[PDB]
Design a protein around this ligand. Structure first.
Ligand SMILES: Nc1ncnc2c1ncn2[C@@H]1O[C@H](COP(=O)(O)OP(=O)(O)NP(=O)(O)O)[C@@H](O)[C@H]1O
Ligand SMILES: Nc1ncnc2c1ncn2[C@@H]1O[C@H](COP(=O)(O)OP(=O)(O)O)[C@@H](O)[C@H]1O
Ligand SMILES: [Mg+2]
Ligand SMILES: [Mg+2]
Ligand SMILES: [Mg+2]
Lengths: 372, 7, 742, 139
């Protein structure tokens, strides 16, 4: 018939597709490249700027901008290029024909929603749309109405507790630690072993090292004693030019900074202790159920061992008599999209859309009262 | 952001 | 007023839904009425329906009655059936047809020739009058024609269609035998024991008889609709599964079916749940022989028959695959599991490819795919959705083989098509099956009421009477309750997707959405698990408690793709041979199939038959006044009659009116113009034109008025008679006084 | 009624007295009224009798003097023709139809009464000249 688009801006990856699909079919990094060198050959078809996987391929000659930093859109002209690329090139669909559903992290500036709506209605002429909290969608994605969602992608981390479909807006926590800043730390520890990555093209190489080789130690201090006292832990990786690099304690040491942000220099406690401090802000009747369901979402939660490390130290913080249960499906990297896929295909949701009439009547302010 | 941070 | 001394009334009674009573003394506009029976009664109000004047009873037309209400209808059918032994009766357009449970001579070919090419009013109602009046429409209109048959299984529908076909063969072939030979297989696959009835047909069945430009029988196409797939996996108490599984289990001792390792009828989980494997009044062992014989008459090879029984025994074994929940989020199959071992041996699929895919589901993404586990509820749901998917494809394949047998090569110029469909349904407990069956009947009753309204508008133009007096009573609001978005089916499809959806939260969504927003949805006073819908026929109560586990089909493509791989035998991939549909629910597949049906009927101007089953024990030519009142409500005949009670049901030619009511005329009025004479007389007699319309050729009366005329006629006739007899008796007494003098 | 009328009526009354006590039964009262030229309906006769019960109508006896006020009270062409024209339009009436209606409707008479009054007035086809039959019964 007609089917809602569902789009997640994330940071790093964009992932997009149609409502009721099983998984997104547009997936590509939300990255905008411009050529920085002097162009010599006359007539090779050089563009002004490349987007997504095209910029990943040519990135040798490009500066790469990420237009979203910590879930805030910092650069709007380059964001419009990414949406334009998603609808026209990647999904090949005319945006007037389809309601769109868009995803955002909580506790971020309201100008971000005013602008994102103004652009959706006025340039695309999208007939109706909605903006949904990323954490909320992970429960739809996992078949629950109760839990505390710990969600971290690139950029923002946030915890949102939900008890039978009621949010608890006073107990929401947000942290800026996740995903990119892990990489910007890993470059400095690799520099300590005498490899130096100085440019945005090299950053993507480090990000792939992180994705292949990093893992979370169950006990950080014993494993640093192990790596210091042994070779066994040390693993070797091949750069795109066929050089080979060897990485020992650095590989576990990098995702450890999720649990001890002091390494990068933040004040706040790690994700375990903002999770616990989130649950403590909820009234005593429900903690029994929030401890019974903890849902991990987004790709920065996919380091091996992170689920165990969470369950172990929360079982250290919590009262001694309770199930602490961490629920981390292997699908979790896509959960916020799968949850939006479900939400957009409900029937009850069809009243919820902001429709173009109501924006014409009331202007971008309407988003705040209709949307969460 | 606009204040307490670079974005 | 309308009641007097010597008036008669119908009054409700235990033994028969109405009894006749007379007014022992005239009513006065008090709470008390003096009544005479058949004696003593005094009855009150807090009015009784009046009785029709006794010339009009048994007219072989129910709309000609001058009072139209349940006991007049029931009395007409009862007297025609018991006294006349006439079993067919016109009601408006409809042919009401009453199952005698007894043979009759009347179907012979001389009577066919008698009906042949005569219009319905010229001859007394008969099924041939319907077939004939389709045939002449197909010729005259150059438009296809339909016949529609409604009623409980056992009401005769199959035999009514049989004679409707024989009429065509005699006016215009091998089809009649070849089609008749289909019935045992399509019964065996498509009929079920149901709590009220055996052999309830659980699907719509549509035959198309093709004609050349010379309107001689080519051959027949067959189609099916609305199949009740949910029954394959789940039954309420005292129901069976589709017959074929029991006929197959009874066969299990025979030499071929040894290969299947069939057990007994209560060993398999899909047969066991009903409680009631054995129908007394049948033996299933025999019926298999009828089924195989009809297969062979339809040229399904002895190879394919054993294929079919392989697949069915597959399904029965599949249902016994018994997952152990191994974790909250994960389940498995306990090793070397015998039900699955036998299913694979039956099917050729590798044991471990199935054992893996039954318990895991797979996601595809750019550069990436995940196998992931599923919870035991989802495993059981997916298994059952596979069993339903196999069965529905098998049924469509068998129907497409019968169509190979019945097609004939010369192109169809136009066709007459005959629809056997189940009537409106109600039992003490009502569930998703009855919700589907009643929604379908609502769609058909809409299309009927639309067509009857059209025919009224035509007949009104034929007499040049303003349309304005007709109105169209429209069940459309109930359809927009059931099927439209934010409707009961739409919220049911929603509660499948929702996390921790349940019947208890589904009910609360119903009550929130509709409870006082719509006139037709009602909550039962003492319960929060049930809900009520006022259908056209009656108010009906449905339980929420089942619907969600019945509405959930979804099939994991991996398990189909495992079955498609198997090369032990050909039939198995042949079923699948022809992506969104794997994710549709049962309610949505039904709502689609019903649109395919309505798209078919809307093309093709229908004629209607209703079959009613007058007594419960199959006693020949007995009638029971409460059994029939049920089925005449469930067929919507009684609403249709109420709809015609609004409007002008009684229609008289001026000749007939003048002839009947000269006694009311006075000759000072009466003209050489009869029609003006009648106009003048009626203008004297009834003081409202509002109660009747004059037309070109007819007088249209509002419902009561003809009985009022019959009353005043009888009273005047009686007064004149009394004056004659008193005058004669006076003269005879003067003469007897002279005898006394002598 | 004058003395002469009262004497003639008493004489006629006494002719119907089959017991000699100078009385008739209530059930004979209507017959006497009709014998004296009145044409009351059975309903009118029972009404003027005071709606007697079966037992006193058949066995309670009254003399002429008590009967007389009732006769007085009861005593105190185009309609007859139209009444016959109800059953007509060639000026005839079936003998069978008149017989049926007189024996089955209204104050039903016996077949023998109807045969007696109809004797000689119907032709071979079984048709009654109702103007002649009416004049006959009014004579
Ligand atoms: N018009 C009819 N004339 C003679 N017998 C009839 C007629 N209608 C029904 N029957 C009897 O009905 C009995 C059982 O029903 P049947 O006629 O077989 O219909 P059916 O095959 O059961 N179709 P269904 O109503 O779906 O069950 C048969 O023995 C018939 O003799
Ligand atoms: N297998 C993996 N292991 C560890 N980190 C990963 C893995 N895959 C992706 N990442 C990191 O996760 C981040 C992306 O998370 P994602 O949920 O896609 O963010 P967003 O939701 O903002 O798009 C990237 O920084 C990427 O490097
Ligand atoms: Mg995210
Ligand atoms: Mg049948
Ligand atoms: Mg039958």
């Amino acid at each position: 018939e007609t089917t809602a688009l569902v789009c997640d801006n994330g940071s790093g990856l964009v992932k997009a597709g149609f409502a009721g699909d099983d998984a997104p079919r547009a997936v590509f990094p939300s990255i905008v490249g411009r050529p920085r060198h002097q162009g010599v050959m006359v007539g090779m078809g050089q563009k002004d700027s490349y987007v997504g996987d095209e910029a990943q391929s040519k990135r040798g000659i490009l500066t790469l901008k990420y237009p979203i930093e910590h879930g805030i859109i910092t650069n709007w002209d380059d964001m419009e290029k990414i949406w334009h690329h998603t609808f026209y090139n990647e999904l090949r669909v005319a945006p007037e024909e389809h309601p769109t559903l868009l995803t955002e992290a909580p506790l971020n500036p309201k100008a971000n929603r005013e602008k994102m709506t103004q652009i959706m209605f006025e340039t695309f002429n999208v007939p109706a749309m909605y903006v949904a909290i990323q954490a909320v969608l992970s429960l739809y994605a996992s078949g629950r109405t109760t839990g505390i969602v710990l969600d971290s992608g690139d950029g923002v981390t946030h915890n949102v507790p939900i008890y039978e479909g009621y949010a608890l807006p006073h107990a929401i926590m947000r942290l800026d630690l996740a995903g990119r800043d892990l990489t910007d730390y890993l470059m400095k520890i690799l520099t300590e072993r005498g490899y130096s990555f100085v440019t945005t093209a090299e950053r993507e190489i480090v990000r792939d090292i992180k994705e292949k080789l990093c893992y979370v130690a169950l006990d950080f201090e014993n494993e640093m004693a192990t790596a210091a006292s042994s070779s066994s832990l040390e693993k070797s990786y091949e750069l795109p030019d066929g050089q080979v690099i060897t990485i020992g304690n650095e590989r576990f040491r990098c995702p450890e900074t999720l649990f001890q942000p002091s390494f990068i220099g933040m004040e706040s406690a790690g994700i375990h202790e903002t999770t616990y401090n989130s649950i403590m802000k909820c009234d005593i009747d429900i903690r029994k159920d929030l401890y019974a369901n903890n849902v991990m979402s987004g790709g920065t939660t996919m380091y091996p061992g992170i689920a165990d490390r969470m369950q172990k130290e929360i079982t250290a913080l919590a009262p001694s008599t309770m199930k602490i249960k961490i629920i981390a499906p292997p699908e979790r990297k896509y959960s916020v999209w799968i949850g939006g896929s479900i939400l957009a295909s409900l029937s009850t949701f069809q009243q919820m859309w902001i429709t173009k009439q109501e924006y014409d009547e009331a202007g971008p302010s309407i988003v705040h009262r209709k949307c969460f | 952001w606009x204040a307490x941070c670079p974005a | 007023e309308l009641y007097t001394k010597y008036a008669r009334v119908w009054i409700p009674d235990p033994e028969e839904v109405w009894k006749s009573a007379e007014l022992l003394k005239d009513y006065k506009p008090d709470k008390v009425l003096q009544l005479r029976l058949e004696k003593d009664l005094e009855y009150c109000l807090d009015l009784p329906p009046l009785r029709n004047p006794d010339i009009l009873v048994g007219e072989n037309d129910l709309t000609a009655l001058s009072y139209l209400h349940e006991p007049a209808v029931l009395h007409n059918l009862k007297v025609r059936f018991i006294d006349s032994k006439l079993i067919y009766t016109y009601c408006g357009i409809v042919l009401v047809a009453i199952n005698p449970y007894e043979q009759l001579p009347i179907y012979g070919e001389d009577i066919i020739n008698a009906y042949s090419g005569q219009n319905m009013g010229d001859m007394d109602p008969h099924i041939f009058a319907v077939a004939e009046e389709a045939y002449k429409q197909m010729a005259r209109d150059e438009r296809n024609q339909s016949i529609i048959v409604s009623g409980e299984s056992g009401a005769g529908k199959t035999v009514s269609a049989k004679y409707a076909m024989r009429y065509f063969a005699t006016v215009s072939a091998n089809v009649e035998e070849k089609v008749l030979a289909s019935n045992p297989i399509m019964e065996s696959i498509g009929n079920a024991k149901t709590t009220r009835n055996d052999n309830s047909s659980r699907f719509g069945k549509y035959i198309e008889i093709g004609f050349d430009k010379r309107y001689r029988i080519i051959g027949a196409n067959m189609r099916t609709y609305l199949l009740e797939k949910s029954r394959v996996v789940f039954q309420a108490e005292e129901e069976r599964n589709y017959h074929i599984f029991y006929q197959l289990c009874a066969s299990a001792a025979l030499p071929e079916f040894k290969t299947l390792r069939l057990g007994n009828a209560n060993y398999f989980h899909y047969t066991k749940q009903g409680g009631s494997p054995v129908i007394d009044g049948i033996d299933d062992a025999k019926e298999m022989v009828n089924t195989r014989q009809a297969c062979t008459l339809l040229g399904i090879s002895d190879s394919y028959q054993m294929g079919i029984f392989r697949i069915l025994a597959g399904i029965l074994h599949l249902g016994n695959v018994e997952f152990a929940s191994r974790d909250s989020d994960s389940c498995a199959i306990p090793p070397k599991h015998d039900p699955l071992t036998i299913f694979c041996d039956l099917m050729g699929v590798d044991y471990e490819e199935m054992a893996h895919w039954l318990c895991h589901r797979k996601l595809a993404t750019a550069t990436e795919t995940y196998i992931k586990p599923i919870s035991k509820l989802h495993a059981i749901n997916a298994r059952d959705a596979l069993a339903k998917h196999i069965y529905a494809n098998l049924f469509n394949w068998i129907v497409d083989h019968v169509n190979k047998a019945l097609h004939s090569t010369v192109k169809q110029h136009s066709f007459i098509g005959v629809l056997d469909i189940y009537g409106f349904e109600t039992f003490e407990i009502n569930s998703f099956e009855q919700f589907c069956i009643n929604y379908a009947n609502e769609k058909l009753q809409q299309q009927f009421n639309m067509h009857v309204f059209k025919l009224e508008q035509e007949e009104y133009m034929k007499e040049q009477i303003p349309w304005t007096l007709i109105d169209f009573y429209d069940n459309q609001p109930c359809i927009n309750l059931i099927e439209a978005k934010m409707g009961v089916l739409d919220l049911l499809d929603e509660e499948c997707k929702m996390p921790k959806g349940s019947d208890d939260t589904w009910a609360q969504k119903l009550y929130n959405t509709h409870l006082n927003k719509c006139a037709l949805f009602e909550k039962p006073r003492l319960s929060n698990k049930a809900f009520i819908i006022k259908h056209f026929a009656d108010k009906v109560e449905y339980q929420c408690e089942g619907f969600l586990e019945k509405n959930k089909d979804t099939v994991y493509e991996e398990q189909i793709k495992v079955l498609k791989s198997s090369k032990k035998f050909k039939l198995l991939p042949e079923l699948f041979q022809d992506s969104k549909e794997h994710k549709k629910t049962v309610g949505h597949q039904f709502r689609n199939s019903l649109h395919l049906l309505m798209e078919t009927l809307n093309a093709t101007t229908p004629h209607y038959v209703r079959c009613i089953k007058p007594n419960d024990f199959k006693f020949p030519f007995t009638f029971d006044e409460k059994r029939a009142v049920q089925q005449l409500r469930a067929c919507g005949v009684l609403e249709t009659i109420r709809i015609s009670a609004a409007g002008f049901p009684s229609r008289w030619t001026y000749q007939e009116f003048f002839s009947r009511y000269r006694v009311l005329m006075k000759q000072k009025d009466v003209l050489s113009d009869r029609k003006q004479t009648c106009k003048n007389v009626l203008e004297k007699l009834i003081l409202d034109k509002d109660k009747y319309q004059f037309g070109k050729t007819k007088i249209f009366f509002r419902a009561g008025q003809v009985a009022y005329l019959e009353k005043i006629r009888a009273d005047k006739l009686r007064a004149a008679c009394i004056r004659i007899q008193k005058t004669i008796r006076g003269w005879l007494m003067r003469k007897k006084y002279m005898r006394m003098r002598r | 009624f004058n003395k002469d009328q009262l004497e003639e009526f008493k004489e006629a009354f006494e002719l119907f007295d089959r017991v000699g006590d100078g009385k008739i039964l209530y059930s004979q009262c209507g017959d006497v009224m009709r014998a004296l030229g009145q044409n009351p309906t059975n309903a009118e006769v029972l009404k003027v009798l005071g709606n007697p019960k079966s037992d006193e109508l058949k066995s309670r006896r009254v003399d002429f003097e008590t009967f007389l006020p009732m006769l007085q009270a009861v005593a105190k062409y185009e309609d007859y023709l139209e009444g016959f024209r109800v059953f007509d339009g060639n000026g005839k009436v079936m003998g069978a139809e008149l017989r049926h209606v007189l024996t089955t409707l209204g104050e039903k008479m016996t077949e023998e009464e109807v045969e007696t009054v109809l004797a000689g007035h119907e032709d071979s086809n079984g048709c009654i000249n109702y103007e002649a039959f009416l004049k006959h019964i009014l004579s």
